[PDB]
Design a protein around this ligand. Structure first.
Ligand code: BCL
Ligand code: BPH
Ligand code: BPH
Ligand code: PGV
Ligand code: CRT
Ligand code: HEC
Ligand code: HEC
Ligand code: HEC
Ligand code: HEM
Ligand code: LMT
Ligand code: LMT
Ligand code: LMT
Ligand code: LMT
Ligand code: LMT
Ligand code: MG
Ligand code: MG
Lengths: 47, 268, 45, 274, 344, 318, 47, 47
């Protein structure tokens, strides 16, 4: 599995991976803020 | 006060509009200054310079050229003696050539004093070269190869045959046609691409349908076949200088007025 | 432009990680089915 | 009076009409025969517009309105104060615009240039005559032309647009707007490209050639059309904007009377997804 | 393009000042088709203006036609049969004037149509009396009969139901728009401006009264509802926006043609008939959809939400600036004049 | 019949150009460049290579997320029917948030998706802008593209972010749809009293007309002088030739004044950017500081008064 | 039929075929999701 | 099946496959969110 860096540049992959992870993290945080139950700022009552 | 109001009648939108009018007036004034970087100061019909002031005429713009060619100054004054004479004495009169305007570079045949060195690619080699000096470049398949076709003048008379193609390395396009003259005093002649029309079986409406060309060849409506011999000659081989480019293309530009005379005189 | 030896080695790693992806997905689908099955039936849930 | 390089080009010939008699300059302007006719039609049209402004209710520049005749006058000439003045000015405008184009032809011939500019201006003239002649002719009344006023013809555009309840849904208008948006987008890119190479980021740097121009757009958007292509495409987009504008207004009324969104029911009712 | 196609020659009427482009260009060939479609059927026989026994005395179950002479009562029965009962596709037991009646005894309100017809009798006379500001603008209006909004069909061809509320979904919210709807010209405008303005009392006004901002809470989304409503009004009358507006000054009533004022009364009148006459029918019209006469062949009597088919401007303008091109059909039927005068 | 320089008659083929060597600190260019015959008919035949650095991949990913949110929501609006998706595609949209939520974060049911798509589309556009800046600097060229791009972003930002921020409602923003955003455009003018009377809308149109006019002039002028090498504009700027002289003289003799080869592109640059610059200001003014543009026009003596062909209609609602 | 690979390049044919099959599969799944009967996620009652 | 890597370049195949897999995963999650039964964030009742 270490051979994955034989095919892909470790620097370029890390840039692409970090960009993907932050975009996904922002996407998921944004989706939760767009829900009634999981908006920790609005604080709607459970159930 | 109303939310947009400023002085009862004045409002924010109105003063914002006037702010832009100030900026636009300054921008037009700035743009007109840039327009005067070439062709100024103005001169009278006899050559006497006109007064330009200082708020309009900007300081000379100095472009540093690549390839160690030095620096270039906008507003270069051409030094060749003008072989023209004013037809009338009043200002605004046309000028008449005191000789042959086609060869003297006057009117539509006028050429500027461009650099006497060939244009170079970023790598540093000549930009415009004949196909014999670089086999790495070839005419594209699907386009008729001018090499071999006979070149016809404006009067329909044959003027020569294409001997080679001069191409631009930066932009993969034919720049000039090296034409071996049918009439000989091997004298070759340069025909710019924009002054010629290719009429082969691969141009369009002929490759699409499959029709052969009835009279394939290179057609030049700018000059008659007789005037092909006087097209300015390039000094060297496998290399064309920018000044030589200007003179060849200026000679063709004046052909419609001085060679074929179809633009000479009113239509009706 | 891959030689036969490297092609086999890539395939061996490719197959193993494909199984790992599928096995994790299989577990995810088993958990999803135990939560809410997605085949309606004639009555439709 | 002359640019430093102008004297050699100020030669005789290249005219279409008049030949030698009108072949001269007044300051920077070349006159020619069609310049005289341009001045004749321009002065006459401007004087009649100012006369209509004087006889109008106000001298306010935005509010001056030379309206066309009523629709009841059809294709005939109305009284001057009842839209006839607009009809005369329209003829003067067409005479001035065509003379201006033909004047540009003479200047093009005198300089050895191609006729691209007068032809491109012809598209602009075609749009005007579509608005002022062709569409009124197809509708059967000169009163369908737009009025000659800075703000009044904007009201005309609004009312014609809402004569079809949604002018955005006009298919040719959709094409024409995109071309107008495309040519401005291309113009901004092309002006930026030429300025970027002639004005490098670091002051007093070597000037960049066509290789840098091509490389930037290949680096930026993956394709560079080249110095020749951008002027071909830019002229094409500008002329397509003018041409499809004429199509969009000529099909509104003469060839379509209902709401423009109605027209799209052909697409919705296609037998593949009806 | 349309059939007949839009091409020269064309007709154009100018409503505003010259050059303001306040005009309507329409197809003369399509107009000829519409004029043929909007031809008023001739009355069966002239009105019985003479006196006689009252309808309420001869017949026992008469609630709304109590002021009618027995001869006038019979004349109305014959005409409404021609106006409402279609002579095509009706079940055998509801053909002729058995559509609203039990043949054995006519005093029985067995079919729901008879109870509905009673409500429409009051609605038609209420329109002709209390809404003359729209249908009789200055004493010379055409008025309204059953044929005006029915045109020989059991159910008017132009009706509208309240748009059912979309399921609350986390993905794919459309806000009641963003789909091509024929009622609003196949645009993406809100599909249901009718409930907003023709059911509840909402003024279709969004434009501010002063140049600078003030207490105007109208947002862009609720002008799209106004735009959708005005698209229907233009489409339902076969006119354009300039018929009622100088669109450069759209809110300015001083620059609007007088047709706009009449159209305003049409909005008030259409809202009133939808609330006072159409909506209450839900308790009368059977919901089984098999008890409807002819089933669903004549059209849906109820919507997805169970609401009654309500009245549009298109309901009985039917894409004409005036119903039946302004033909005075009600003048020949005094029985449907509640309190207004429609003679001559 | 002479050659009009509309289509390249003879194309030539050779080695593909990989671009000028980028300075250290730049990613390698991606893709294998190839030649397209039909593209070479109008301009350069070479397609690619492209530069995909961190900004390029980040902008592509952010733009992909925004497009997916829009596309999946429009697909969901037609019940995931691909037939109805294609048929109704111009009519579908990702609707902006409901007005009841103001500037607060809306649920997915009532416009939460729009805010995410707007956020990721804005991030994609912003990352594309700095990429436009960076690609110019790395070549040593001036950053004229980035600042012309910033003007376009300025109008985009005010349309969907800045004006809704000033109005305190995301509902004021533009739907992500083809016809619905035309409906929003029409409704915007209707709501605020005939945006024709917005003076900055007038200015934006004048520059939009002027930009189209300028490219019609400039494109035709360069094509008419390309026989003298007019298309090689940067070479003409550094070393003026007869093509520049003829181009300037044609316009000097026509309208009494002219530009240079460099300064015409300054006219081109400014007319284009002023279209969105004036337009963005005009959009920012309406609703915040002017609420009825026609009434603003009558207040400032802009709106013409027309003779009454009918009596003024009293408002029946008192 | 084995001689089709002398005309069709196996690499480009497989790329086009695999892409076509996935697009068709997504197309068909989405079509069924739109139907009332075959929407397995909505679970509408049969008959 | 190891011979598929003699045709397909492993690098671009992995880039295409990973981009392919993420889009499909995003599709399915979006589709489930659009349903009443499988929207885990909103949590509608079963039956
Ligand atoms: C009934 C309709 C109204 C009207 C309502 C409006 C409204 C509302 C607006 C305009 C605007 C304009 N109007 Mg107007 N307008 C009217 C009539 C006209 C007429 C005419 C002859 O009738 C003309 C010629 C115009 C022309 C114009 C332009 C001058 C101006 C748009 C400039 C521009 O190019 O931005 C277009 C470019 C952009 C908006 C964005 C720029 C680039 C961005 C960054 C693109 C990003 C691409 C992205 C990454 C792609 C992926 C996206 C995803 C796939 C989703 N209008 C009438 C009066 N008009 C705009 C303006 O600013 O005017 C003040 C504006 O907001
Ligand atoms: C078709 C592509 C675009 C285009 C192209 C184009 N326009 C051109 C050219 C070209 C190629 C020229 O060569 C020519 C020129 O000389 O440019 C400087 C021109 C030109 N385009 C001009 C304007 C112009 N172009 C416009 C549009 C466009 N032009 C298109 C978008 C517009 C718009 C949309 O509003 C305008 C206003 C001029 C600056 C110029 C033509 C000058 C001309 O015709 O000169 C002779 C006439 C006069 C000097 C005055 C005549 C006055 C009349 C006798 C009376 C007034 C009549 C008029 C109808 C009044 C209307 C008033 C109301 C509308 C307020
Ligand atoms: C001066 C004002 C004018 C102007 C100027 C202007 N526009 C500009 C610029 C300039 C100067 C640029 O430099 C910039 C540009 O890039 O130009 C080439 C741009 C631009 N103007 C654009 C559009 C545009 N301009 C417009 C208008 C205007 N632009 C004005 C008229 C408009 C209109 C009228 O609405 C539009 C639509 C773009 C072409 C571009 C900016 C593009 C951008 O920011 O993109 C960011 C990145 C993305 C959104 C990527 C999304 C697409 C990907 C393909 C996603 C998918 C990834 C992956 C392939 C998924 C695979 C999935 C499969 C496996 C299933
Ligand atoms: C990655 C790995 C993921 C794998 C997921 C595969 C899911 C398949 C699950 C099948 C289980 C069937 C269960 C069942 O027994 O379904 C029965 C009918 O099945 C039947 O005919 C047969 C139903 C078959 C439906 C699927 C058909 C196509 C699947 C093949 C796809 C291959 C790729 C009926 O069920 P009920 O009792 O009415 O339900 C009541 C509901 O409230 C809850 O279900
Ligand atoms: C596999 O892929 C499939 C689904 C095919 C994908 C295909 C998808 C398709 C076909 C998509 C089609 C998309 C279309 C047609 C889109 C049309 C878009 C149009 C015409 C848009 C026009 C105008 C829109 C504008 C001007 C929107 C502007 C929005 C802005 C500026 C939003 C800004 C939001 C921000 C900055 C959010 C910030 C987050 C905050 C700060 C609020 O967080 C608290
Ligand atoms: C049927 C019961 C009608 C409905 C529903 C609506 N309208 Fe009407 N309208 C109706 C009649 C019989 C008449 C004729 C009155 C007359 O002048 O003879 C009208 C008239 C109008 C007009 C005036 C037309 C003109 O040229 O002046 C307008 C503008 C109008 N109606 C508009 C209108 C609108 C917008 C409606 C829906 C909200 C509407 N009407 C409903 C009968 C009926
Ligand atoms: C337009 C304003 C109308 C006028 C005038 C009259 N009617 Fe009507 N009617 C109208 C509508 C929109 C509907 C549909 C209501 C529904 O739920 O479908 C009706 C319906 C009827 C019916 C019922 C038809 C059926 O269900 O089979 C009847 C019997 C009926 N209308 C009769 C009727 C008569 C006799 C009228 C003149 C006095 C009359 N209607 C006027 C709209 C309008
Ligand atoms: C007559 C039949 C009309 C036609 C055709 C159109 N409109 Fe209208 N509009 C009409 C009336 C009577 C009213 C007043 C509504 C009320 O309940 O008071 C309106 C109103 C509008 C408005 C709102 C005006 C305001 O003060 O905010 C707008 C924006 C509007 N109308 C636009 C509009 C458009 C775009 C039309 C063409 C498609 C259009 N209207 C047609 C009457 C009539
Ligand atoms: C030619 C066929 C018809 C005849 C002969 C006829 C005859 C009558 C008679 C005699 C009555 C009075 C019944 C009584 O109270 O004893 C009556 C009432 C009534 N008819 Fe008709 N009718 C016919 C068609 C219709 C149609 C088609 C409708 C529906 C559109 C209709 C609607 C009514 C209604 C609503 C009443 C009750 C009147 C009221 O309550 O004021 N009739 N009809
Ligand atoms: C309002 C007063 C003038 O407003 C100002 O004028 C300058 C004059 O160059 C112009 O500014 C313009 O020229 C400057 C150089 O001077 C350049 O950086 C640039 O091309 C542009 O900003 C604009 O018009 C405006 O920034
Ligand atoms: C494109 C160039 C041609 C444009 C179309 C011209 C066709 C001629 O069309 C015809 O014009 C003449 C004017 O000369 C009119 O002839 C007469 O009509 C009315 C009659 O009161 C008068 O207002 C008009 O001045 C009078 O000349 C006809 O009513 C019209 O139908
Ligand atoms: C240049 C474009 C081509 C022009 C060549 C003529 C094309 C045909 C136009 O023909 C023109 O059409 C209009 C309406 O469209 C008609 O003119 C019509 O207008 C009047 C109102 O003014 C109508 O009452 C009447 O139906 C009719 O006379 C005539 O038929 C003719 O004037
Ligand atoms: C990109 C970055 C753009 C930044 C723009 C500058 C800051 C704008 O500042 C912003 O102005 C608007 C307009 O008053 C305010 O908006 C406020 O007033 C409006 C008035 O209609 C209310 O509807 C709204 O509820 C309220 O938030 C914001 O509270 C403020 O934060
Ligand atoms: C060439 C030199 C410039 C020529 C233009 C001169 C402009 C004079 O500007 C003049 O200003 C006065 C106010 O002082 C305006 O006065 C009026 O303006 C407009 C109507 O036009 C009204 O909205 C305003 O209430 C009123 O004061 C005149 O309308 C304008 O004509
Ligand atoms: Mg819905
Ligand atoms: Mg909308």
């Amino acid at each position: 599995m270490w051979r994955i860096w034989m095919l892909f540049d470790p620097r370029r992959t890390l840039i692409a991976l970090f960009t993907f992870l932050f975009v996904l993290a922002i996407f998921i945080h944004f989706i939760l803020l767009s829900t009634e139950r999981f908006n920790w700022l609005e604080g709607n009552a459970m159930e | 006060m109303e939310t947009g109001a400023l002085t009862g009648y004045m409002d924010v939108a109105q003063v914002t509009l006037y702010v832009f009018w100030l900026f636009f007036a300054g921008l037009i004034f700035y743009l007109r200054r840039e327009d005067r970087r070439e062709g100024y100061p103005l001169e009278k019909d006899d050559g006497t310079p006109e007064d330009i002031g200082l708020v309009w005429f900007p300081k000379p713009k100095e472009f540093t050229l690549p390839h160690g060619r030095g620096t270039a100054t906008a507003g270069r004054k051409d030094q060749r003696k003008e072989p023209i004479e004013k037809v009338y004495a009043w200002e605004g009169s046309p000028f008449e050539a005191t000789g042959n305007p086609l060869l003297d570079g006057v009117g539509p045949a006028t050429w500027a004093e461009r650099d006497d060195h060939p244009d170079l690619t970023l790598e540093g080699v000549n930009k415009v070269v004949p196909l014999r000096a670089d086999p790495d470049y070839y005419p594209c398949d699907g386009d008729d190869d001018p090499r071999g076709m006979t070149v016809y003048g404006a009067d329909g008379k044959a003027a020569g045959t294409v001997g080679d193609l001069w191409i631009d390395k930066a932009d993969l396009i034919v720049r000039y046609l090296e034409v071996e003259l049918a009439d000989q005093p091997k004298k070759t002649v340069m025909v710019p691409r924009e002054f010629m029309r290719v009429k082969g079986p691969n141009t369009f409406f002929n490759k699409l349908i499959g029709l052969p060309s009835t009279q394939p060849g290179i057609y030049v409506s700018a000059l008659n076949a007789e005037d092909f011999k006087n097209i300015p000659q390039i000094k060297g081989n496998d290399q064309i200088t920018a000044l030589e480019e200007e003179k060849i293309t200026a000679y063709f530009g004046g052909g419609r007025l001085y060679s074929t005379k179809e633009h000479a005189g009113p239509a009706l | 432009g891959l030689s036969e030896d490297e092609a086999k080695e890539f395939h061996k790693i490719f197959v193993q990680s494909f199984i790992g992806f599928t096995v994790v997905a299989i577990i995810a689908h088993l958990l999803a089915w135990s939560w809410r099955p997605w085949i309606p039936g004639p009555e439709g849930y | 009076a002359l640019l430093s390089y102008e004297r050699k080009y100020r030669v005789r010939g290249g005219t279409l009409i008049g030949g030698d008699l009108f072949d001269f300059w007044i300051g920077p302007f070349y006159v020619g025969f069609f310049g005289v006719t341009t001045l004749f039609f321009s002065f006459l049209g401007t004087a009649l517009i100012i006369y209509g402004a004087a006889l109008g209710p106000t001298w306010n520049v935005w509010q001056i309105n030379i309206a066309p005749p009523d629709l009841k006058y059809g294709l005939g000439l109305a009284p001057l104060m009842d839209g006839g003045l607009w009809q005369i000015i329209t003829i003067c405008a067409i005479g001035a615009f065509v003379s201006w184009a033909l004047r540009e032809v003479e200047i093009c011939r005198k300089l050895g240039m191609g006729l691209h500019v007068p032809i491109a201006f012809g598209v602009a003239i075609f749009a005007y005559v579509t608005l002022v002649v062709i569409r009124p002719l197809l509708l059967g009344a000169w009163g369908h032309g737009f009025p000659y006023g800075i703000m009044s013809h904007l009201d005309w555009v609004s009312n014609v647009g809402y004569q079809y309840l949604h002018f955005h849904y006009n298919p040719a208008h959709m094409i024409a707007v995109s071309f107008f948006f495309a040519t401005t987008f291309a113009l901004g890119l092309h002006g930026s490209a030429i300025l970027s190479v002639s004005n490098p980021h670091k002051k007093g740097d070597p000037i960049k050639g066509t290789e840098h121009e091509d490389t930037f757009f290949r680096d930026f958007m993956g394709y560079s059309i080249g110095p020749l292509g951008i002027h071909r495409l830019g002229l094409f987009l500008a002329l397509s904007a003018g041409f499809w504008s004429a199509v969009c207004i000529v099909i509104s009324g003469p060839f379509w009377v209902g709401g423009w969104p109605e027209w799209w029911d052909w697409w919705l009712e296609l037998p593949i997804w009806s | 393009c349309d059939d007949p196609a839009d091409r020269p020659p064309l007709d154009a009427d100018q409503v505003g000042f010259r050059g303001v482009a306040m005009e309507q260009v329409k197809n003369p060939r399509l107009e000829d088709i519409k004029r043929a479609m909007n031809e008023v059927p001739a009355p069966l026989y002239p009105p019985i203006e003479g006196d006689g026994p009252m309808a309420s005395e001869v017949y026992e179950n008469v609630q709304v036609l109590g002021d009618l002479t027995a001869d006038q009562f019979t004349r109305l029965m014959a005409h409404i049969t021609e106006w409402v009962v279609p002579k095509e596709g009706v079940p055998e037991d509801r053909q002729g004037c058995n559509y609203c009646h039990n043949p054995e005894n006519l005093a029985e309100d067995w079919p729901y149509t008879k109870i509905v017809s009673r409500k429409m009798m009051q609605m038609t006379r209420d329109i002709n009396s209390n809404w003359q500001d729209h249908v009789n603008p200055n004493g010379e209006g055409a008025g309204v009969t059953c044929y005006t909004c029915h045109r020989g069909n059991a159910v008017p061809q132009a009706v509208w139901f309240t748009s059912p509320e979309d399921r609350p979904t986390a993905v794919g919210w459309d806000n009641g728009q963003n789909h091509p709807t024929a009622a609003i010209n196949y645009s993406s405008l809100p599909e249901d401006p009718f409930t907003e303005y023709l059911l509840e009392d909402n003024a279709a006004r969004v434009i501010s009264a002063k140049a600078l901002p003030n207490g105007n809470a109208s947002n862009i989304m609720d002008t799209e509802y106004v735009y959708a409503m005005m698209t229907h009004m233009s489409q339902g009358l076969g006119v354009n926006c300039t018929y009622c507006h100088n669109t450069r000054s759209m809110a300015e009533w001083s620059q609007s043609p007088p047709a706009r004022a009449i159209a305003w009364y049409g909005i008030q009148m259409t809202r009133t008939v939808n609330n006072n006459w159409m909506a209450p029918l839900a308790s009368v019209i059977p919901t089984d959809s098999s008890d409807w006469i002819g089933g669903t062949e004549f059209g849906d009597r109820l919507g997805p939400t169970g609401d009654v088919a309500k009245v549009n401007c298109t309901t009985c303008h039917q894409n004409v600036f005036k119903p039946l091109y302004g033909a005075k059909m009600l003048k020949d039927h005094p029985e449907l004049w509640g309190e207004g005068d429609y003679s001559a | 019949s002479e050659y009009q320089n509309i289509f390249t008659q003879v194309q030539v083929r050779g080695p593909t150009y990989p671009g000028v060597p980028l300075p250290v600190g730049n990613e390698p260019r991606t893709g294998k460049p190839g030649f397209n015959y039909w593209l070479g008919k109008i301009g350069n035949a070479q397609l690619g290579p492209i530069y995909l650095g961190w900004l390029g991949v980040a902008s592509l990913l952010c733009g992909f997320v925004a497009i997916e949110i829009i596309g999946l929501n429009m697909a969901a609006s037609v019940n995931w029917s691909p037939i109805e998706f294609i048929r109704q595609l111009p009519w579908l949209a990702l609707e902006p948030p409901a007005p009841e939520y103001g500037l607060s974060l809306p649920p997915l049911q009532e416009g939460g998706w729009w805010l995410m798509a707007g956020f990721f589309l804005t991030a994609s556009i912003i990352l594309w802008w700095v990429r436009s800046y960076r690609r110019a600097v790395q070549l040593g060229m001036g950053t004229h593209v980035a600042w012309a791009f910033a003007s376009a972003i300025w109008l985009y930002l005010v349309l969907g972010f800045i004006r809704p921020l000033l109005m305190g409602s995301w509902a004021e923003a533009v739907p992500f749809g083809i016809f619905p955003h035309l409906d929003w455009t029409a409704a915007f003018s209707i709501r605020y009293g005939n945006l024709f009377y917005n003076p900055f809308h007038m200015l934006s149109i004048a520059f939009l007309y002027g930009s189209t006019l300028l490219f019609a002039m400039h494109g035709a002028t360069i094509l008419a002088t390309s026989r003298f090498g007019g298309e090689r504009e940067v070479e003409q700027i550094a070393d003026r030739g007869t093509a520049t002289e003829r181009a300037g003289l044609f316009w000097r003799w026509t309208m009494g004044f002219n530009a240079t080869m460099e300064s015409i592109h300054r006219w081109a640059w400014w007319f284009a950017v002023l279209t969105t610059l004036t337009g963005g200001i005009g959009i920012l003014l309406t609703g915040t500081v002017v609420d009825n543009w026609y009434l603003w026009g009558v207040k400032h003596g802009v709106a013409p008064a027309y003779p009454e062909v009918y009596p003024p209609t009293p408002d029946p609602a008192a």
